[PDB]
Amino acid sequence: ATDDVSKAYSSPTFDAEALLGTVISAEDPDRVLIEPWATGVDGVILDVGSGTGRWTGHLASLGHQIEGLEPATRLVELARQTHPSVTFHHGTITDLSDSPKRWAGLLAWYSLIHMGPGELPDALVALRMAVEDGGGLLMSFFSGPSLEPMYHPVATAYRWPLPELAQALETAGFQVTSSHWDPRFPHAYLTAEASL
Amino acid sequence: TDDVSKAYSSPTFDAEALLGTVISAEDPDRVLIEPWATGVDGVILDVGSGTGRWTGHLASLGHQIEGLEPATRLVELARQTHPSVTFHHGTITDLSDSPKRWAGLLAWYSLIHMGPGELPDALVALRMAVEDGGGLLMSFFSGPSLEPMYHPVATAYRWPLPELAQALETAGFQVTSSHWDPRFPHAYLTAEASL
Ligand SMILES: Nc1ncnc2c1ncn2[C@@H]1O[C@H](CSCC[C@H](N)C(=O)O)[C@@H](O)[C@H]1O
Ligand SMILES: Nc1ncnc2c1ncn2[C@@H]1O[C@H](CSCC[C@H](N)C(=O)O)[C@@H](O)[C@H]1O
């Protein structure tokens, strides 16, 4: 559940600064995925579960209009001191439904990995209501042949088969425009477009 | 550059879930690693031991072994999980700093991120860390041509037997055995340190 997960990430026994990192490496393979996507966003990007803000600051430095959303108290505060010119919102995905705010695109980089079938559905719905119609979504997650839990050092994670996740997205108002996954690893990612 | 090792320490990579922390008694890799380890008459060095799953396993079987891991979070995890086993926090190249030598080297998928411009010298450093006539057991990704391949941490590489065997011979290693199923990239081989 997000409550226990968020406090696990803000736990003083977890130094995200060193583990997650506060700056992106020039050799980071995710750059070729996120950077191109970001350029395609015509408006303010919302980095969902920005954590230490490493990608938020990186994209902001490259001229992108972007803000962050992070429920982990220690992390969001940490992100502000590290990236003083970037706006970081302290809150959860569901909190987004409490405001009329809407962004042009959504970046959820491994921020949805701790949500199972009883939680992701509602999160996707809130996300859809937080992005402009036709707006984009880039998310990375863990996939596999079955929808099942998976050990993770911070909090329990979940593997989501493409069929189940794509259906959840469609039900939520998102259409998958691209996806990628290598069966030898759970790591996977996809792009979607806000629709009906 | 410690970008690779740091990426391996990241919770996002989730080393404990992808590689594991414990060795299943039914793991098929056991029949490959154990027979080899038994042949090493001395201390084995687990190069890029990660979570220390194999290091603890072989240690519990009576094998004299130590681990080498640059990934901070992983090396610290290995130490708490196997308090009886020694784990050195360093990289293959750091081996040149110490005159220490091991009787055998186990490199289970710890060299996959090394392309044609890095593997050659990494193998030289390995040769310097093993006793003459010592043994080397390594697993890697193979294929019809030396090309890069996808991997969550960083670019990985497929090494054809010809190219890899030649790099090993140049490094002072002689391939004693090799295995590979052309259907899958997974491969492995044993080698003996020259005299
Ligand atoms: N509903 C939710 N909304 C936002 N963040 C959430 C969430 N549930 C879990 N998280 C979190 O998502 C993050 C996942 S780990 C870091 C992800 C970040 N995009 C990066 O690549 O560095 C953590 O900061 C954690 O607090
Ligand atoms: N130069 C280097 N020296 C030592 N380890 C290295 C390295 N370059 C990459 N590695 C790493 O090698 C490991 C490969 S993945 C895990 C391998 C381990 N033998 C197992 O089977 O579980 C990672 O822990 C990673 O940090």
Residue A32 and residue A95 in contact, taking contact as beta carbons nearer than 8 Å: no
Domains of chain B: 1-195 (3.40.50.150)
Q: How many CB atoms lie within 10 A of CB B61?
A: 13
Angstrom distance (rounded) from CA A121 to CA A165: 9
How many other β-carbons are positioned within 10 Å of the β-carbon of residue B193? 23
How far, in Å, is the centroid of ligand 2 from the Cα of B92? 10
Resolution, Å (one decimal): 2.0
List own/partner pairs for B38-42 with CB under 8 A and 24 or more apart: B38/B63, B39/B104, B39/B135, B40/B103, B40/B104, B40/B134, B40/B135, B41/B103, B42/B102, B42/B103, B42/B104, B42/B131, B42/B134
Three state DSSP letters for A6-68: HHHHCCCCCCHHHHCCCCCCCCCCCHHHHHHHHHCCCCCEEEECCCCCHHHHHHHHCCCCEEE
Which residues in chain B have their CB less than 8 angstroms from residue A18's CB? 9, 72
Ligand 2 lined by B57 (C-beta under 6 Å): no
Closest CA to A154 of A34, A51, A24, A81: A51
CB–CB contact A27 B72 (8 Å): no
- Spatial separation of the C-alpha atoms in residues A86 and A95, rounded to whole Å: 20
Method: X-ray
Ligand closest to Cα of B122 equals 2
What atom of ligand 2 comes closest to residue B71's alpha carbon?
Answer: 26
Ligand 2 centroid distance, CA of A88 (Å): 35
CA of B51, closest atom in ligand 2: 22
Ligand 2 test: best mutation among B2, B3, B5, most atoms within 8 Å of CB? Answer: B5
Give B105 to chain A, closest Cα distance, Å. Answer: 26
Edge-first strand order for the sheet with A103-109 is A88-90, A66-70, A45-48, A103-109, A131-142, A187-194, A174-181
In chain A, the residue whose alpha carbon lies closest to the alpha carbon of B2 is A25
